[PDB]
């Protein structure tokens, strides 16, 4: 089998993406964050407190023919930017983009911390990182991707993610016309439960390629990319009046500036992020002040290839045996 979704911007600043997801029988259709950096599908729900929902669709289980209490079964969630969510689990039909899962863990939020509410676009997150991440207790669930596997004509998604536009995600294909050139693959680590590897280097602008190993993750469920600060120094240094603004929370740059292409590595291979997918626009309306796209990670404890980065590739999230991941120009 194979399936294939359309993933749409919430915005204007690509702030995220979301892929409508089909749940329950008759279909309950939500919005969901396909979030490569977490392992846990969870919904707004006919359960969640009703002060913590503000505009999303939710799922409602009671009207679902095929949904099942996972008896004694709770999730809790908190997620690298300080968001939070928890409640219990359904089993349901789950399908993306026509292909199916039976039996998906359906995590229903009873809570949502403030973030979640004040998002008006985002009906839940449907996790695609390792398994062993999913929070369900006592018994740990499994993701779409990992149910969907053995079924799948090849056990790979794809991420092909628009700049300012929809993209796609994949399942069990690689569409080979949806990229320029050949996909450089590169080795995971699922140590930690993430999609992560090593880039061999960047470069900023027109600048000469600096080899050096950059671990890291691919993760479509953050928005920035977020780099070691010698890197991020280093590109920001190449903008007029950028500096890190301790109050702000980042690097910000004068919005009249042009910004200079950022390039990373994958093995021998060079995947190139245009300057304009790096202004975050005014910090706040009206304000001749920009937020970057490209940002520190020091004090997060790993290097995150958020959107900013995948958005400029066609992304292969390889869940052979050993998993891999490829990349390619687009």
Same mark, same amino acid.
């Given at each position: ?8 911007? &919430?915005?204007?600043? %690509? /702030?995220? !993406? ?12 939500? *919005? ?17 407190? #009703? ?7 939710? !799922? +409602? ?5 095929? @949904? ?8 809790? &969630? ?17 399908? $993306? ?11 229903? #939020?009873?809570? $949502? ?9 985002? /009906? ?22 990992? *149910? ?11 991420? %092909? ?28 680590? +699922? ?26 993750? @691919? /993760? ?5 990319? !977020? ?9 920001? @240094?190449? $903008? ?28 021998? #291979? ?6 304009? !997918?790096?202004?975050?626009?005014? &910090? ?17 404890? &790993?290097?995150?290839?958020? /959107? $900013? ?8 999230? *390889? ?8 990349? #390619?120009?687009?």
């Amino acid at each position: 089998s194979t399936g294939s979704a359309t993933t749409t911007p &919430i915005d204007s600043l %690509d /702030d995220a !993406y979301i892929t409508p997801v089909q749940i329950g029988t008759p279909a309950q259709t939500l *919005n969901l964050d396909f979030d490569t950096g977490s392992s846990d599908l969870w919904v707004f729900s006919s359960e969640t407190t #009703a002060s913590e929902v503000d505009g999303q669709t939710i !799922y +409602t289980p009671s009207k679902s023919t095929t @949904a099942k209490l996972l008896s004694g079964a709770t999730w809790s &969630i908190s997620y690298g930017d300080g968001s939070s969510s928890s409640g219990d689990v359904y089993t349901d039909t789950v399908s $993306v983009g026509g292909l199916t899962v039976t039996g998906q863990a359906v995590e229903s #939020a009873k809570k $949502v911390s403030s973030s979640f509410t004040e998002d008006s676009t985002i /009906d839940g997150l449907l996790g695609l990182a390792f398994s062993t991440l999913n929070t369900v207790s006592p018994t740990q669930q499994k993701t779409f991707f990992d *149910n969907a596997k053995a079924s799948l004509d090849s056990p790979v998604f794809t991420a %092909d993610l628009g700049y300012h536009a929809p993209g796609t995600y994949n399942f069990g294909f690689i569409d080979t016309t949806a990229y320029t050139g050949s996909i450089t693959y590169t080795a995971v680590s +699922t140590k930690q439960g993430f999609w992560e590897w090593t880039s061999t280097g960047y470069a900023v602008g027109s600048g000469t390629f600096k080899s050096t190993s950059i671990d890291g993750i @691919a /993760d479509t469920g953050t928005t920035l990319l !977020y780099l070691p600060a010698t890197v991020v120094s280093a590109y920001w @240094a190449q $903008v007029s009046g950028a500096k890190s603004s301790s109050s702000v929370g980042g690097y910000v740059f004068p919005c009249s500036a042009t910004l200079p292409s950022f390039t990373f590595g994958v093995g021998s #291979a060079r995947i190139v992020i245009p300057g304009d !997918y790096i202004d975050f626009g005014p &910090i706040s309306t009206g304000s001749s002040s920009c937020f970057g796209g490209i940002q520190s990670s020091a004090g997060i404890g &790993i290097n995150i290839f958020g /959107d $900013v980065a995948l958005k400029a590739a066609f992304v292969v999230f *390889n869940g052979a045996t050993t998993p891999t991941l490829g990349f #390619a120009s687009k």
